[PDB]
Coordinates of C-alpha atoms in Angstrom, one line a residue:
Chain B
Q1 CA 45.5 109.3 181.1
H2 CA 42.6 108.3 179.7
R3 CA 43.9 104.8 178.6
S4 CA 43.4 101.9 181.6
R5 CA 45.1 98.4 181.7
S6 CA 42.3 96.9 184.0
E7 CA 41.8 94.7 180.5
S8 CA 45.0 92.9 181.1
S9 CA 44.8 92.2 184.4
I10 CA 44.8 88.2 185.4
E11 CA 41.4 88.1 186.3
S12 CA 40.7 89.4 182.9
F13 CA 43.1 87.5 181.4
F14 CA 42.1 84.0 182.5
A15 CA 38.8 84.5 184.1
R16 CA 36.2 83.1 181.1
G17 CA 34.2 80.6 181.3
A18 CA 35.0 78.0 178.6
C19 CA 33.9 74.1 177.7
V20 CA 36.4 71.4 179.0
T21 CA 34.5 68.1 178.7
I22 CA 31.8 66.2 177.5
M23 CA 30.3 63.9 179.3
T24 CA 27.9 60.9 177.7
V25 CA 25.1 59.1 179.3
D26 CA 22.0 57.4 177.8
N27 CA 18.7 55.6 179.5
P28 CA 18.5 52.6 177.8
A29 CA 15.1 50.7 177.4
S30 CA 13.6 48.2 179.3
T31 CA 13.6 45.3 177.2
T32 CA 17.1 44.8 176.6
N33 CA 19.2 44.0 180.2
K34 CA 22.5 45.9 179.0
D35 CA 24.5 47.9 182.0
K36 CA 23.2 51.7 182.4
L37 CA 26.0 53.6 181.0
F38 CA 27.2 56.4 183.4
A39 CA 30.3 58.2 182.8
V40 CA 33.6 59.6 184.6
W41 CA 35.9 62.1 184.5
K42 CA 39.0 63.8 186.2
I43 CA 39.4 67.2 186.4
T44 CA 42.4 68.7 184.8
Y45 CA 43.1 71.3 182.0
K46 CA 45.9 69.5 180.4
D47 CA 43.3 68.8 177.3
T48 CA 42.2 72.2 176.6
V49 CA 44.8 74.0 174.6
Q50 CA 43.8 77.5 175.0
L51 CA 43.5 77.6 178.7
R52 CA 46.3 75.2 179.3
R53 CA 48.7 77.7 176.6
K54 CA 47.7 80.6 178.8
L55 CA 48.4 79.1 182.4
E56 CA 52.2 77.9 181.3
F57 CA 53.3 81.7 181.0
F58 CA 53.7 80.7 184.3
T59 CA 54.7 78.0 187.0
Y60 CA 53.0 78.7 190.5
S61 CA 49.4 79.3 190.0
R62 CA 46.2 79.3 192.7
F63 CA 42.7 80.0 191.7
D64 CA 39.2 78.6 192.4
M65 CA 36.9 76.5 189.8
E66 CA 33.2 77.8 189.3
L67 CA 31.6 75.1 187.5
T68 CA 28.2 75.0 185.0
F69 CA 27.1 72.1 183.3
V70 CA 24.5 72.3 179.9
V71 CA 22.8 69.0 179.7
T72 CA 21.1 67.9 176.5
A73 CA 19.0 64.5 175.7
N74 CA 17.3 63.0 172.6
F75 CA 15.4 59.6 171.6
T76 CA 17.7 57.7 169.6
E77 CA 15.6 55.2 167.7
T78 CA 12.4 55.9 165.9
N79 CA 9.1 54.5 168.2
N80 CA 6.2 55.7 169.6
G81 CA 7.0 54.8 172.8
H82 CA 7.6 58.3 175.2
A83 CA 9.8 58.7 178.4
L84 CA 9.0 61.1 180.7
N85 CA 11.2 63.5 182.7
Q86 CA 14.4 62.9 183.8
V87 CA 16.9 63.9 186.5
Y88 CA 20.5 63.4 186.9
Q89 CA 23.1 63.2 189.8
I90 CA 26.4 64.8 189.1
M91 CA 28.4 63.7 191.9
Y92 CA 32.1 65.8 192.7
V93 CA 33.8 63.3 194.4
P94 CA 37.0 65.4 196.2
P95 CA 40.9 64.7 195.8
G96 CA 42.0 61.6 197.1
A97 CA 38.5 59.3 197.6
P98 CA 37.2 56.3 195.9
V99 CA 35.5 56.7 192.3
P100 CA 32.6 54.4 190.9
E101 CA 33.1 51.5 188.9
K102 CA 29.4 50.4 188.5
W103 CA 26.3 52.5 187.5
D104 CA 25.1 50.9 191.0
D105 CA 27.2 51.1 193.9
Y106 CA 27.8 52.5 197.2
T107 CA 30.4 55.3 196.1
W108 CA 26.7 56.8 195.0
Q109 CA 25.7 57.1 198.3
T110 CA 28.3 58.2 200.9
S111 CA 27.4 61.4 202.4
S112 CA 31.5 62.6 202.0
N113 CA 30.6 63.2 198.4
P114 CA 28.1 65.8 197.3
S115 CA 26.2 65.9 194.5
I116 CA 23.7 68.1 192.7
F117 CA 20.2 66.1 191.5
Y118 CA 19.4 68.5 188.2
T119 CA 15.8 68.4 186.6
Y120 CA 15.9 68.3 182.8
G121 CA 14.5 71.3 181.3
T122 CA 15.4 73.8 183.7
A123 CA 18.3 76.1 184.5
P124 CA 21.7 74.6 184.4
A125 CA 23.3 73.5 187.2
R126 CA 26.2 75.2 188.8
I127 CA 29.1 75.1 191.9
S128 CA 31.7 76.4 193.1
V129 CA 35.1 74.4 193.8
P130 CA 37.6 75.7 196.6
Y131 CA 41.5 76.1 196.4
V132 CA 42.4 72.5 196.8
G133 CA 45.5 71.7 197.3
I134 CA 48.5 70.5 199.9
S135 CA 51.2 73.4 198.8
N136 CA 50.9 76.6 198.9
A137 CA 50.1 76.7 195.4
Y138 CA 49.8 74.7 192.1
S139 CA 52.8 73.8 190.6
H140 CA 52.9 73.6 186.4
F141 CA 56.5 73.1 186.3
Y142 CA 58.6 70.7 189.2
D143 CA 62.0 69.6 188.9
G144 CA 61.8 66.9 191.0
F145 CA 61.4 63.1 191.8
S146 CA 58.9 61.3 194.3
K147 CA 61.9 58.6 194.6
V148 CA 65.3 58.9 194.4
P149 CA 68.1 56.5 193.7
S150 CA 59.5 58.3 191.0
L151 CA 58.4 60.6 188.2
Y152 CA 59.3 63.6 186.5
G153 CA 57.3 66.8 186.7
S154 CA 54.2 66.8 190.7
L155 CA 50.8 66.2 188.9
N156 CA 47.9 68.4 190.6
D157 CA 44.7 66.6 191.3
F158 CA 41.7 68.2 191.7
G159 CA 39.0 65.9 192.0
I160 CA 36.1 63.8 189.4
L161 CA 33.2 64.0 188.3
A162 CA 30.3 60.9 188.0
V163 CA 27.9 61.7 186.6
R164 CA 24.3 58.7 186.0
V165 CA 20.7 58.9 185.3
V166 CA 18.6 58.2 188.3
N167 CA 15.2 57.1 186.5
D168 CA 14.9 53.8 185.9
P169 CA 15.0 52.1 182.2
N170 CA 12.2 53.3 179.9
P171 CA 10.3 51.6 177.4
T172 CA 12.6 53.9 175.0
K173 CA 16.5 54.4 174.5
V174 CA 17.2 58.1 175.5
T175 CA 21.0 59.8 174.9
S176 CA 22.1 62.4 177.4
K177 CA 25.7 64.5 176.7
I178 CA 26.7 67.2 179.5
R179 CA 29.0 70.1 178.7
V180 CA 31.1 70.7 181.5
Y181 CA 31.9 74.9 181.2
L182 CA 35.1 75.7 184.2
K183 CA 36.1 79.4 185.1
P184 CA 39.0 80.3 187.1
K185 CA 38.1 82.7 189.9
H186 CA 40.4 84.7 192.2
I187 CA 43.1 83.5 190.2
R188 CA 47.0 85.0 191.2
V189 CA 49.8 83.6 189.4
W190 CA 53.9 83.8 189.8
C191 CA 57.6 84.0 188.1
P192 CA 56.7 84.4 184.5
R193 CA 58.1 82.3 182.0
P194 CA 58.3 82.4 177.6
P195 CA 55.2 80.7 176.3
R196 CA 55.6 77.8 174.0
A197 CA 54.2 77.6 170.4
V198 CA 51.1 75.6 168.9
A199 CA 52.8 72.3 168.4
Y200 CA 50.4 69.4 169.6
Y201 CA 51.6 71.0 173.2
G202 CA 52.8 67.6 175.0
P203 CA 51.6 65.9 178.0
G204 CA 55.1 67.2 179.9
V205 CA 57.5 69.7 179.0
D206 CA 58.9 67.1 176.6
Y207 CA 58.5 68.2 173.0
Chain C
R1 CA 65.9 76.0 202.7
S2 CA 68.7 79.0 201.3
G3 CA 69.3 81.3 199.1
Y4 CA 72.3 81.8 196.7
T5 CA 74.6 84.4 195.3
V6 CA 76.3 83.3 192.6
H7 CA 79.2 85.2 190.9
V8 CA 80.7 84.5 187.0
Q9 CA 83.5 85.7 185.6
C10 CA 85.6 85.6 183.0
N11 CA 89.6 85.9 182.0
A12 CA 89.9 87.6 178.6
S13 CA 92.4 89.9 176.8
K14 CA 91.8 93.0 174.8
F15 CA 91.8 91.4 171.7
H16 CA 88.8 89.0 172.3
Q17 CA 85.3 89.6 171.2
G18 CA 82.1 87.8 172.2
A19 CA 78.9 87.9 174.4
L20 CA 77.5 85.6 176.9
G21 CA 74.3 85.5 178.7
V22 CA 73.5 84.0 182.2
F23 CA 70.2 82.9 183.5
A24 CA 68.7 82.0 185.9
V25 CA 65.6 79.7 185.5
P26 CA 63.3 78.2 189.0
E27 CA 61.9 75.1 188.2
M28 CA 64.5 74.3 185.5
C29 CA 63.0 71.4 184.1
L30 CA 65.0 70.3 181.1
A31 CA 63.9 67.5 178.3
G32 CA 66.4 66.4 175.8
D33 CA 65.4 65.1 172.3
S34 CA 63.1 62.1 173.6
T35 CA 63.9 61.8 181.6
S36 CA 65.7 59.8 185.2
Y37 CA 67.4 61.1 187.8
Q38 CA 70.5 60.2 186.5
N39 CA 69.9 62.6 183.8
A40 CA 68.4 65.7 185.5
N41 CA 71.2 65.7 188.1
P42 CA 74.8 65.6 186.7
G43 CA 77.1 67.3 189.5
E44 CA 79.1 69.8 190.1
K45 CA 80.5 69.1 186.2
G46 CA 77.9 69.8 185.2
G47 CA 75.7 69.5 181.6
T48 CA 75.8 71.0 177.7
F49 CA 73.2 72.3 175.5
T50 CA 73.5 71.5 171.5
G51 CA 72.4 72.6 168.6
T52 CA 71.2 70.7 165.7
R53 CA 73.2 61.0 176.6
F54 CA 71.1 63.7 177.4
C55 CA 71.6 67.6 176.1
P56 CA 68.6 69.8 175.4
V57 CA 68.4 72.4 172.6
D58 CA 70.2 75.7 172.8
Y59 CA 67.8 77.4 171.0
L60 CA 64.9 76.1 172.7
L61 CA 66.3 76.5 176.1
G62 CA 65.7 72.2 176.4
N63 CA 61.9 73.3 177.7
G64 CA 60.2 73.7 174.2
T65 CA 60.3 77.8 174.3
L66 CA 62.4 79.9 171.9
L67 CA 65.5 82.0 173.5
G68 CA 64.9 84.8 172.7
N69 CA 61.8 85.2 175.1
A70 CA 64.7 83.6 177.8
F71 CA 64.7 87.1 178.7
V72 CA 61.9 86.8 181.3
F73 CA 64.0 85.0 183.4
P74 CA 66.4 86.4 186.0
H75 CA 69.5 87.4 183.4
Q76 CA 72.4 89.2 183.1
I77 CA 74.3 90.0 180.0
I78 CA 79.0 89.6 180.0
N79 CA 80.0 91.6 176.6
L80 CA 83.9 91.3 176.8
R81 CA 84.2 94.5 175.7
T82 CA 82.4 96.2 178.4
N83 CA 82.7 94.2 181.3
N84 CA 83.5 91.1 182.2
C85 CA 82.2 89.4 185.2
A86 CA 78.4 88.9 186.6
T87 CA 76.6 88.5 190.0
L88 CA 72.9 87.2 190.9
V89 CA 71.5 87.2 193.6
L90 CA 68.9 84.5 194.2
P91 CA 66.2 84.3 197.2
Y92 CA 65.0 80.9 197.5
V93 CA 61.4 80.0 195.7
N94 CA 59.3 77.1 196.1
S95 CA 55.4 76.3 196.4
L96 CA 56.4 75.5 200.2
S97 CA 57.7 77.1 202.4
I98 CA 60.8 74.4 203.4
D99 CA 61.4 71.2 201.1
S100 CA 63.5 68.4 200.7
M101 CA 66.6 69.2 199.3
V102 CA 68.3 65.8 198.1
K103 CA 65.1 65.4 196.0
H104 CA 64.3 68.7 194.5
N105 CA 66.2 71.7 192.2
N106 CA 65.3 74.8 193.3
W107 CA 67.0 77.1 190.8
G108 CA 69.2 75.9 187.3
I109 CA 71.8 77.9 186.3
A110 CA 72.4 78.7 182.3
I111 CA 74.7 79.9 180.0
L112 CA 74.7 80.2 176.8
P113 CA 77.0 82.2 174.0
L114 CA 75.1 85.0 172.1
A115 CA 77.9 86.0 170.0
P116 CA 80.6 83.4 169.3
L117 CA 84.0 83.6 170.4
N118 CA 86.7 85.7 168.4
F119 CA 90.7 87.0 168.8
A120 CA 92.5 88.4 166.8
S121 CA 95.9 86.2 165.4
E122 CA 98.2 83.8 167.7
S123 CA 96.0 84.7 170.7
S124 CA 95.2 82.3 173.3
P125 CA 92.4 80.0 171.2
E126 CA 89.8 79.4 174.3
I127 CA 89.3 81.3 177.5
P128 CA 88.4 80.6 181.3
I129 CA 85.2 81.5 182.9
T130 CA 84.7 80.4 186.4
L131 CA 81.9 80.3 189.0
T132 CA 81.7 81.2 193.1
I133 CA 78.3 80.1 194.4
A134 CA 77.8 81.1 198.2
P135 CA 74.2 79.7 200.0
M136 CA 72.9 82.4 202.0
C137 CA 70.8 82.1 205.1
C138 CA 70.2 78.4 204.7
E139 CA 68.9 76.9 207.5
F140 CA 67.7 73.0 207.9
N141 CA 65.8 70.6 210.1
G142 CA 65.4 66.9 211.5
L143 CA 68.7 65.7 211.3
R144 CA 69.7 62.4 211.5
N145 CA 72.8 60.6 212.7
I146 CA 76.3 60.2 211.1
Chain H
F1 CA 104.8 88.6 189.0
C2 CA 107.3 89.3 186.6
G3 CA 105.8 89.0 183.4
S4 CA 103.7 90.9 180.6
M5 CA 101.4 93.9 181.5
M6 CA 99.1 92.8 179.0
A7 CA 98.8 89.3 181.1
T8 CA 95.5 88.1 182.7
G9 CA 95.3 85.1 184.7
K10 CA 94.4 83.3 188.6
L11 CA 96.8 81.2 191.1
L12 CA 95.7 80.2 194.3
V13 CA 98.0 80.1 197.4
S14 CA 97.2 77.7 200.2
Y15 CA 98.3 77.4 203.4
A16 CA 98.2 73.6 205.1
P17 CA 98.7 74.0 209.0
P18 CA 101.0 71.7 210.7
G19 CA 100.4 68.0 211.0
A20 CA 99.0 67.3 207.7
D21 CA 100.2 66.0 204.6
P22 CA 100.3 68.5 201.8
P23 CA 98.3 69.3 199.4
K24 CA 98.3 67.1 195.6
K25 CA 94.7 68.6 193.5
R26 CA 93.6 71.9 193.2
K27 CA 90.4 71.1 194.8
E28 CA 91.9 69.9 198.2
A29 CA 93.3 73.3 198.6
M30 CA 91.0 75.1 197.6
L31 CA 88.5 73.6 200.4
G32 CA 91.4 75.1 202.9
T33 CA 92.8 78.4 203.7
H34 CA 93.6 79.3 200.5
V35 CA 93.5 83.0 198.3
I36 CA 92.8 83.2 195.0
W37 CA 96.3 86.2 193.5
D38 CA 94.5 87.5 189.8
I39 CA 97.4 88.3 187.8
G40 CA 96.3 91.5 186.3
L41 CA 95.3 93.8 188.8
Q42 CA 97.6 92.6 191.4
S43 CA 101.5 92.6 191.0
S44 CA 102.3 91.3 194.4
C45 CA 100.5 88.6 196.8
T46 CA 101.4 88.6 200.6
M47 CA 101.0 85.1 202.9
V48 CA 100.9 85.4 206.8
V49 CA 101.6 82.2 208.4
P50 CA 101.2 82.5 212.2
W51 CA 102.5 80.9 215.5
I52 CA 100.7 77.7 216.3
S53 CA 102.6 75.4 218.9
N54 CA 101.6 73.4 222.2
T55 CA 104.7 74.5 223.3
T56 CA 106.1 78.4 224.2
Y57 CA 109.5 77.5 221.6
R58 CA 110.6 74.8 219.1
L59 CA 113.9 73.6 218.3
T60 CA 115.3 74.9 215.4
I61 CA 117.3 72.2 214.2
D62 CA 115.0 68.9 215.4
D63 CA 114.3 65.7 213.0
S64 CA 110.8 63.4 212.9
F65 CA 108.7 66.4 213.2
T66 CA 107.9 66.5 209.5
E67 CA 105.2 69.3 210.3
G68 CA 104.7 72.8 210.4
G69 CA 102.6 73.5 207.3
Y70 CA 103.4 74.0 203.8
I71 CA 102.8 76.9 201.5
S72 CA 102.2 75.4 198.2
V73 CA 100.7 78.0 194.4
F74 CA 98.6 76.3 192.1
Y75 CA 97.2 76.7 188.5
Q76 CA 93.7 78.2 189.6
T77 CA 93.0 79.3 185.2
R78 CA 95.7 79.2 182.4
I79 CA 97.7 82.5 181.3
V80 CA 96.6 84.2 178.5
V81 CA 98.5 86.6 176.4
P82 CA 96.9 88.9 173.5
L83 CA 99.6 88.6 170.8
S84 CA 103.2 87.0 170.1
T85 CA 104.0 88.4 173.3
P86 CA 106.3 85.2 175.7
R87 CA 103.9 83.4 176.8
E88 CA 106.9 82.4 179.6
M89 CA 106.6 84.1 182.7
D90 CA 108.6 84.5 185.7
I91 CA 108.0 85.3 189.5
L92 CA 110.3 85.9 192.4
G93 CA 109.3 84.8 196.3
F94 CA 110.5 86.6 199.2
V95 CA 110.7 85.8 203.0
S96 CA 110.5 87.7 206.2
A97 CA 109.7 87.1 210.0
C98 CA 106.7 89.5 211.6
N99 CA 107.3 92.1 214.8
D100 CA 106.6 89.0 217.3
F101 CA 109.6 86.5 216.1
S102 CA 112.1 85.5 218.8
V103 CA 115.2 83.3 219.6
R104 CA 117.0 82.0 222.6
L105 CA 119.9 79.6 223.5
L106 CA 122.2 80.9 221.2
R107 CA 124.3 77.7 220.4
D108 CA 127.1 78.5 217.6
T109 CA 128.7 75.7 215.4
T110 CA 130.8 77.4 212.8
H111 CA 134.8 75.6 212.6
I112 CA 137.0 75.5 209.5
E113 CA 138.7 72.9 210.7
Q114 CA 139.5 69.6 208.2

């Protein structure tokens, strides 16, 4: 037999990096004193059609995450004033911790939240998150309620990603976008199910 | 925690024809055409699918997936001209090693007519289907009073 | 069961022990001691009632007892027939004593007096 089944394996079928979100931040002008924008996004796969649809083939799952960040920037007005190099703080808030609510706040200080400091113009930043969960596997479908006479189908908690620019305001407003590329790793699945059609999918098992 | 053994039987004569499919869906999250705790738990009375209250869609199995693919789930076929009994031995399936039974339903059992019922003239116009469930390897912890 | 060879169905034969009033619904009888008799592959059903009493003997004629148990037959399932076959069947019953029965204290009261 000169044909192998090694390209349909679970790792081959799933472990591929795809963009999951685009987070916008900016460093405003030092003249106008409006608040500096910061980005917050909760980790969830229910916004990428392809990854979700490939996950709904099964009901129980386990995997680690590999996250990469691609940062780009641009001036947003025709001014001769320029800016120096920029450094970005990319904070990962594990599942269960408070989320930032203002750009300057103790949440960008806690020793518990691990951060990355990335200087513009260098190789993209990368990290790996392990399997974080209280059960022995994620559950895409859950026939249960939180309270019995309450939500019908548990939701999975992965963490949060917050992003800001460490530099203080320049005299020039510069806007930046960070694209997050996620890659599941060491994945295992259980109990296959029939796949759903492309009907925009849905928030739950509702249709 | 516990497993189950389900035995389905159909009483039919040699002049009846039709086919049934029995499917054992793990974590059978259903949906109607909009749920509450009253809909997902109808009790021993059970519920009924429907075609084109809370009544999922038969050809979608109530969860948006086509009926034809439903054979990925553990299943059996009762063809009246070959056999009229089916048996499924369901082990315990859950992400946790043990869980609260009062809030969580491990399995769902669905019975769907693949080929409608027909019979010779003047026969019995409707035949009975019986379910018999036996728990296996049960065990409980955290005993309260009463 | 003295019905047709082409009939099919199920009956529930339940035994209620002494001191318990008779069951009135098939579900109540199902939770007790019972047997499902399948009309279609067996023509006769046997049920042995054991010996239960505080004393070693019991009086043949007694009043206010209102116990001893009951035997009941319930429709577990309807009866299905293939064709114009008659839908009315008959069943007969027979009773006997096992090899551990006994009696004592002979009493005779037969009299033709007027």
